[PDB]
Design an enzyme around this catalytic site. Structure first.
Site, PDB file in Angstrom:
ATOM      1  N   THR A   1      44.619  36.521  42.178  1.00 39.62           N
ATOM      2  CA  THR A   1      43.646  35.536  41.711  1.00 39.62           C
ATOM      3  C   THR A   1      43.722  35.439  40.195  1.00 39.62           C
ATOM      4  O   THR A   1      42.915  36.042  39.466  1.00 39.62           O
ATOM      5  CB  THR A   1      42.228  35.875  42.198  1.00 39.62           C
ATOM      6  OG1 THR A   1      42.271  36.015  43.619  1.00 39.62           O
ATOM      7  CG2 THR A   1      41.186  34.762  41.803  1.00 39.62           C
ATOM      8  N   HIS A   2      44.742  34.723  39.731  1.00 38.58           N
ATOM      9  CA  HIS A   2      45.001  34.573  38.294  1.00 38.58           C
ATOM     10  C   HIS A   2      44.974  33.119  37.896  1.00 38.58           C
ATOM     11  O   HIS A   2      44.418  32.781  36.849  1.00 38.58           O
ATOM     12  CB  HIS A   2      46.381  35.136  37.950  1.00 38.58           C
ATOM     13  CG  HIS A   2      46.421  36.619  37.748  1.00 38.58           C
ATOM     14  ND1 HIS A   2      46.393  37.520  38.795  1.00 38.58           N
ATOM     15  CD2 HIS A   2      46.596  37.355  36.622  1.00 38.58           C
ATOM     16  CE1 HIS A   2      46.480  38.748  38.313  1.00 38.58           C
ATOM     17  NE2 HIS A   2      46.630  38.675  37.001  1.00 38.58           N
TER      18      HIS A   2
ATOM     19  N   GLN B   1      56.713  43.094  45.809  1.00 39.68           N
ATOM     20  CA  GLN B   1      56.625  42.328  44.557  1.00 39.68           C
ATOM     21  C   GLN B   1      58.006  41.867  44.076  1.00 39.68           C
ATOM     22  O   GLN B   1      58.251  41.764  42.866  1.00 39.68           O
ATOM     23  CB  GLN B   1      55.947  43.146  43.443  1.00 39.68           C
ATOM     24  CG  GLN B   1      54.437  43.342  43.602  1.00 39.68           C
ATOM     25  CD  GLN B   1      53.911  44.504  42.763  1.00 39.68           C
ATOM     26  OE1 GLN B   1      54.688  45.279  42.182  1.00 39.68           O
ATOM     27  NE2 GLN B   1      52.574  44.638  42.705  1.00 39.68           N
TER      28      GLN B   1
ATOM     29  N   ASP C   1      48.339  33.168  30.864  1.00 42.33           N
ATOM     30  CA  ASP C   1      47.920  34.472  31.374  1.00 42.33           C
ATOM     31  C   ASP C   1      48.624  35.553  30.509  1.00 42.33           C
ATOM     32  O   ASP C   1      49.826  35.417  30.179  1.00 42.33           O
ATOM     33  CB  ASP C   1      48.371  34.621  32.836  1.00 42.33           C
ATOM     34  CG  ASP C   1      47.676  35.785  33.566  1.00 42.33           C
ATOM     35  OD1 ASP C   1      47.792  36.975  33.180  1.00 42.33           O
ATOM     36  OD2 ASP C   1      47.045  35.484  34.585  1.00 42.33           O
TER      37      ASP C   1
ATOM     38  N   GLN D   1      45.897  52.593  35.533  1.00 44.73           N
ATOM     39  CA  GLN D   1      46.779  51.689  36.272  1.00 44.73           C
ATOM     40  C   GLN D   1      48.159  52.326  36.402  1.00 44.73           C
ATOM     41  O   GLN D   1      48.550  53.134  35.551  1.00 44.73           O
ATOM     42  CB  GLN D   1      46.924  50.329  35.566  1.00 44.73           C
ATOM     43  CG  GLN D   1      45.594  49.673  35.080  1.00 44.73           C
ATOM     44  CD  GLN D   1      45.328  49.879  33.599  1.00 44.73           C
ATOM     45  OE1 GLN D   1      45.256  48.908  32.801  1.00 44.73           O
ATOM     46  NE2 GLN D   1      45.160  51.129  33.215  1.00 44.73           N
TER      47      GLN D   1
ATOM     48  N   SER E   1      36.660  39.676  56.186  1.00 50.41           N
ATOM     49  CA  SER E   1      37.793  38.796  55.827  1.00 50.41           C
ATOM     50  C   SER E   1      39.052  39.644  55.992  1.00 50.41           C
ATOM     51  O   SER E   1      39.269  40.640  55.257  1.00 50.41           O
ATOM     52  CB  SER E   1      37.638  38.285  54.367  1.00 50.41           C
ATOM     53  OG  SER E   1      38.743  37.462  54.008  1.00 50.41           O
TER      54      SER E   1
HETATM   55  O1  LIG Z   1      38.261  35.714  52.189  1.00 57.25           O
HETATM   56  C1  LIG Z   1      38.291  35.575  50.957  1.00 57.25           C
HETATM   57  C2  LIG Z   1      38.871  36.554  50.130  1.00 57.25           C
HETATM   58  C3  LIG Z   1      38.830  36.405  48.742  1.00 57.25           C
HETATM   59  N1  LIG Z   1      38.334  35.225  48.211  1.00 57.25           N
HETATM   60  C4  LIG Z   1      38.345  35.028  46.764  1.00 57.25           C
HETATM   61  O2  LIG Z   1      39.505  35.624  46.194  1.00 57.25           O
HETATM   62  C5  LIG Z   1      39.233  36.102  44.896  1.00 57.25           C
HETATM   63  C6  LIG Z   1      39.661  37.568  44.792  1.00 57.25           C
HETATM   64  O3  LIG Z   1      39.801  37.909  43.430  1.00 57.25           O
HETATM   65  P1  LIG Z   1      39.984  39.420  42.920  1.00 57.25           P
HETATM   66  O4  LIG Z   1      40.013  39.496  41.441  1.00 57.25           O
HETATM   67  O5  LIG Z   1      38.783  40.131  43.376  1.00 57.25           O
HETATM   68  O6  LIG Z   1      41.178  40.140  43.709  1.00 57.25           O
HETATM   69  P2  LIG Z   1      42.731  39.698  43.821  1.00 57.25           P
HETATM   70  O7  LIG Z   1      42.874  38.555  44.751  1.00 57.25           O
HETATM   71  O8  LIG Z   1      43.212  39.232  42.491  1.00 57.25           O
HETATM   72  O9  LIG Z   1      43.424  40.965  44.206  1.00 57.25           O
HETATM   73  C7  LIG Z   1      37.729  35.980  44.699  1.00 57.25           C
HETATM   74  O10 LIG Z   1      37.394  34.867  43.869  1.00 57.25           O
HETATM   75  C8  LIG Z   1      37.194  35.788  46.110  1.00 57.25           C
HETATM   76  O11 LIG Z   1      35.984  35.053  46.113  1.00 57.25           O
HETATM   77  C9  LIG Z   1      37.762  34.265  49.041  1.00 57.25           C
HETATM   78  O12 LIG Z   1      37.262  33.234  48.594  1.00 57.25           O
HETATM   79  N2  LIG Z   1      37.749  34.450  50.413  1.00 57.25           N
END
Ligand SMILES: O=c1ccn([C@@H]2O[C@H](COP(=O)(O)OP(=O)(O)O)[C@@H](O)[C@H]2O)c(=O)[nH]1
Length: 434
Positions: free
Chosen positions: A13-14, A71, A106, A175, A284
Site C-alpha cells: 500500500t504505497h 519479491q 516514494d 527491519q 479478510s
Molecule cells: O481486505 C482489505 C485489506 C486491506 N485493505 C487496505 O489495505 C491497506 C493496507 O495497508 P498497510 O499499510 O496496513 O499494509 P500493506 O498492504 O502495505 O502491507 C489499508 O489501507 C487497508 O484499509 C482493505 O481495504 N481491505
C-alpha cells in the site's frame, strides 16, 4: 508553470496513499499539472483534472520465466525503474509541453534523488510508513556501527536507546536489512543508500503528525533538511450491512494488508480460536489461502462470522460493532484502527511491522501483543477476552480516544500537519529554476 512528476512504488500500500496526497496537492495548486507514474496494474487499481496517470514498465523482460524467488517482481521493477520512469516522464513532458519542475517520489524509488539532481529540480520523497522506520533507515550506519553486522543472537532484547526516540525499540524489532536478514541483497543495499541520501532531499514528507512523538520529530528535523508531517491522511479524508446487526464493540476484524497471509498453522490457530470463543468476526483472507482453513470451520462459523477476500476495511474499523483488530501492524491499517477507536492485536511479519507493533504495545498502549509473536489458539482467545470483555480493553479504548484527539488537532485549522501541508504545497508549486 509547474509540472510535478510523481513516481509511485507499485507494491503493497504505497501508490494509494501517494495518490491521496497528490489529490490534495492538485486541489491546493490548481495551476500545477501532475503526472502520476506507476505500473498499469497499480494505476488500474488505485484510479482533479490537472492529474493524469501514466503507465510505466513493470520491468519484466518479454519472455521472462520467473525463478519463483520472493519479491522477484520487486527486483525486476526496481532495476528497470530509473529507465521506466525516465521514459514515462518524456511522454508526460511531450503531452503537457511543460518540463518537469519537481520530482515527488516514494522514498523507495531508488535513484529519484539522482534523477532530480540531473534534471535540476527539487526532490520531495514521501515516506509511506512511520517515523520509527524512517528514523532507523536514516541511522543505518550508526546502528550497524554500534551493534555490528555478524548477527544479534543473545542480544535480541537489547534496547536501541542510543537512538533518540527509540528507547523502547529492541534489536529484534529492527527491519530486515539493518543488522540482520540478507544484508547483501538488492533490497538491502538500496534501502541502505536511501537512508544515506534522504538527508539531501529538499523535504521528506510523511503520513504522520509531529506530536506523535515530539522528540523523534525534533531529532528527524535535525537529520533532514526539511521534514514535514502531513497526516494522518485518513483523518483529513455486504460487510457493513452484516455489522449493522451486531452488538457494540463485539466483532473481531482480521486482516494482514495487501501482501501477507499467515502460514497455514497460524491460519489453523486463528480458525480454532474463532470457533472456540464463538466471537463474531470478519476475516479478510486471500481466497487462495482458503485451502488452509480446517474442514468444517466455515460451516461451524457461518452463523456468526464471515471470511471475505476483501473488506471495506477503513469503513469496517469505523463501525461501532467492531471491538478488536487482528493486524500485521502495517502503517495505513494502524491509523484506520485509530480513526475507528479499535484496539489492536499485533502479529507483525517483516519490514517496519515489528517497530509498529512495539509502538502500539509499549509506547502508545493501544494494542496487545501475541505471546511468542505467532498465533496460537489459547493465545488468541486470551487477547479476544482481554480486549472485548475485560478492563484492559477499556483502557486501550481510552488511550485510542486521547490519541485520536491529538491527531485530529494536528490536522485541524492551525494544526502542525495543516501548516506543514501548506509548506509542501509551496514546494510543489515552485516553478523550475531558470
Ligand atoms: O481486505 C482489505 C485489506 C486491506 N485493505 C487496505 O489495505 C491497506 C493496507 O495497508 P498497510 O499499510 O496496513 O499494509 P500493506 O498492504 O502495505 O502491507 C489499508 O489501507 C487497508 O484499509 C482493505 O481495504 N481491505
Amino acid at each position: 508553470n509547474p509540472h510535478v512528476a510523481v513516481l509511485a512504488f507499485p507494491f503493497s500500500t504505497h501508490a494509494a496513499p501517494l495518490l491521496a496526497v497528490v489529490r490534495r496537492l492538485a486541489a491546493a495548486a490548481p495551476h500545477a499539472v501532475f503526472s502520476f507514474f506507476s505500473t498499469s496494474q497499480s494505476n488500474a487499481s488505485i484510479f482533479q483534472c490537472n492529474i493524469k496517470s501514466y503507465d510505466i514498465s513493470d520491468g519484466v523482460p518479454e519472455g521472462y520465466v520467473f525463478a519463483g524467488r520472493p519479491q522477484e517482481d520487486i527486483e525486476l521493477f526496481t532495476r528497470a525503474a530509473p529507465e521506466s520512469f525516465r521514459q514515462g516522464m518524456v511522454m508526460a513532458v511531450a503531452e503537457t509541453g511543460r518540463p518537469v519542475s519537481c520530482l515527488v517520489a516514494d522514498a523507495f524509488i531508488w535513484f529519484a534523488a539522482d534523477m532530480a539532481a540531473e534534471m535540476g529540480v527539487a526532490w520531495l520523497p514521501f515516506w509511506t510508513a512511520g517515523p520509527n522506520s524512517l528514523s532507523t533507515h536514516v541511522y543505518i550506519d550508526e546502528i550497524r556501527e554500534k551493534i555490528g553486522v555478524s548477527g544479534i543472537q543473545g542480544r535480541e532484547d537489547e534496547l536501541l536507546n542510543f537512538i533518540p526516540g527509540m528507547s523502547k525499540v529492541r534489536f529484534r524489532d529492527l527491519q530486515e536489512g539493518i543488522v540482520f536478514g540478507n544484508l547483501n541483497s538488492l533490497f538491502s543495499r538500496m534501502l541502505h543508500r536511501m537512508g544515506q541520501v534522504l538527508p539531501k532531499a529538499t523535504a521528506v514528507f510523511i503520513n504522520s503528525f509531529e506530536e506523535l512523538d515530539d522528540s523523534l520529530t525534533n531529532d528527524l528535523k535535525s537529520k533532514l533538511k526539511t521534514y514535514l508531517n502531513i497526516g494522518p491522511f485518513n483523518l483529513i479524508t455486504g460487510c457493513l450491512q452484516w455489522l449493522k446487526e451486531r452488538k457494540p464493540t463485539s466483532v473481531v476484524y482480521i486482516s494482514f494488508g495487501t501482501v501477507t497471509t499467515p502460514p497455514p498453522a497460524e491460519v489453523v490457530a486463528l480458525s480454532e480460536a474463532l470457533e472456540a470463543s464463538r466471537v463474531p468476526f470478519i476475516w479478510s483472507l486471500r481466497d487462495k489461502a482458503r485451502v488452509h482453513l480446517p474442514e468444517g470451520f466455515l460451516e461451524k462459523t457461518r452463523g456468526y462470522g464471515m471470511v471475505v477476500p476483501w473488506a471495506p476495511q477503513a469503513e469496517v474499523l469505523a463501525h461501532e460493532a467492531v471491538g478488536a483488530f487482528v493486524t500485521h501492524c502495517g502503517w495505513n491499517s494502524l491509523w484506520e484502527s485509530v480513526a475507528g477507536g479499535v484496539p489492536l492485536i499485533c502479529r507483525p511479519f517483516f519490514g517496519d511491522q515489528r517497530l509498529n507493533g512495539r509502538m502500539v504495545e509499549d509506547v502508545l498502549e493501544i494494542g496487545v501483543r501475541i505471546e511468542g509473536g505467532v498465533f496460537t489458539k489459547s493465545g488468541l482467545m486470551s487477547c479476544f477476552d482481554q480486549i472485548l470483555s475485560q478492563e484492559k480493553g477499556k483502557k486501550l479504548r481510552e488511550n485510542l480516544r486521547a490519541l485520536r484527539e491529538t491527531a485530529d488537532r494536528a490536522v485541524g485549522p492551525k494544526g502542525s500537519s495543516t501548516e506543514n501541508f501548506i509548506t509542501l504545497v509551496d514546494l510543489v508549486s515552485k516553478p523550475k529554476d531558470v
